[PDB]
From a paper:
The cGMP-dependent protein kinases (PKG) belong to the family of serine/threonine kinases and are one of the major intracellular receptors for cGMP. Next, two cyclic-nucleotide binding domains (CNBD-A and CNBD-B) are followed by the catalytic domain.
Each cGMP binding site in the PKG Iβ:cGMP crystal shows a clear electron density for cGMP bound in a syn configuration, as previously predicted by mutation and other studies. The cGMP-binding site is comprised of three parts: the short P-helix together with conserved glutamate and arginine residues at the PBC which captures the sugar phosphate (Site 1); a key residue, Thr193 at the end of PBC that bridges the cyclic phosphate to the guanine ring (Site 2); and the β5-strand that provides a unique docking site for the guanine ring (Site 3). The exposed backbone amides of Gly182, Glu183, Leu184 and Ala185 of the P-helix together with the guanidinium group of Arg192, captures the cyclic phosphate through several hydrogen bonds and electrostatic interactions. In addition, the hydroxyl group of Thr193 interacts with the equatorial OP1 of cGMP, bridging the phosphate moiety to the guanine ring of cGMP. While cGMP in molecule B (cGMP:B) is partially exposed to solvent, cGMP in molecule A (cGMP:A) is wedged between the two molecules and participates in crystallographic packing of the two molecules. The CNBD-A bound with syn-configured cGMP shows the lowest B-factors, implying that interaction with the guanine ring is strongest at site 3 compared to other structures.
Author numbering:
A (entry chain A), B (entry chain B): 92 to 218
The structure:
């Protein structure tokens, strides 16, 4: 009669970081505040070690990430585009380019992230 | 005193094409049926010729479309992402993400579409 989204409990400071990361993101700054709240409770945590490759350009890609701790470097076709520290969203562009990753993301140090899948996202967007 | 949504009369064949098109859409799959029916009745027909530009990335989005006949070609910042045939919904991103058109959409052949405007569309998602 309607499918249940999963809830992942977080520290207040974490929920704040996420909200701010979305509001700082060009594609998503305008979402409902009620929608953002829901996204925050759905994001689950994932950790990567340094010289780990999170996203490979060209790949198919659902997941969207917010960085909590650490630092990554974004490269396309060989070129550094930038680095990203906590408070930044990445992985959003896949959907806008036909679910294909548009750049590769490598970890420069250990990182702690939050993630959310295509599917959760879509249910939310219809509320 | 509540607002009256418009009604555009349609061939049962067309009412089904639309319904299917909605269910095929990642986001709209999610709607209750009562609502998918309301949306079907608020769609109005529009045609474009070969080599027409329906949607321009960056512009403001007010309508959402379903294709009935024809083939259309999606592009972003100058790169063929995909093509779309009958039965497929489009122009739903800008509305849901409350952003500016995320891709350009050009016709490859003469097309016949149905359109619902932001107004009716949102009004419907609220019951
Ligand atoms: N393509 C691109 N991606 C970037 C840039 N800066 C940060 N990113 C992030 O890198 C991500 C790579 O995967 P996505 O395309 O899913 O989403 C992309 C963005 O979130 C940039 O300058 N170009
Ligand atoms: N940005 C983008 N839009 C697409 C793609 N494939 C289909 N579309 C549709 O094209 C529409 C362009 O305008 P919208 O951003 O409103 O909504 C978009 C989607 O419905 C794609 O790969 N990228």
């Amino acid at each position: 009669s309607h499918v249940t989204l999963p809830f992942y409990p977080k520290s207040p400071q974490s929920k704040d970081l996420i909200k701010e990361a979305i509001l700082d993101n060009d594609f998503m700054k305008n979402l409902e505040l009620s929608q953002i709240q829901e996204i925050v409770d759905c994001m689950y945590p994932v950790e990567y070690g340094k010289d780990s490759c999170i996203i490979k350009e060209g790949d198919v890609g659902s997941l969207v990430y917010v960085m909590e701790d650490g630092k990554v470097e974004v490269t396309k076709e060989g070129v550094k585009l930038c680095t990203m520290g906590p408070g930044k969203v990445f992985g959003e562009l896949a959907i806008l380019y036909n679910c294909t990753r548009t750049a590769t993301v490598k970890t420069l140090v250990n990182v702690k992230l939050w993630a959310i899948d295509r599917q959760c996202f879509q249910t939310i967007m219809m509320r």
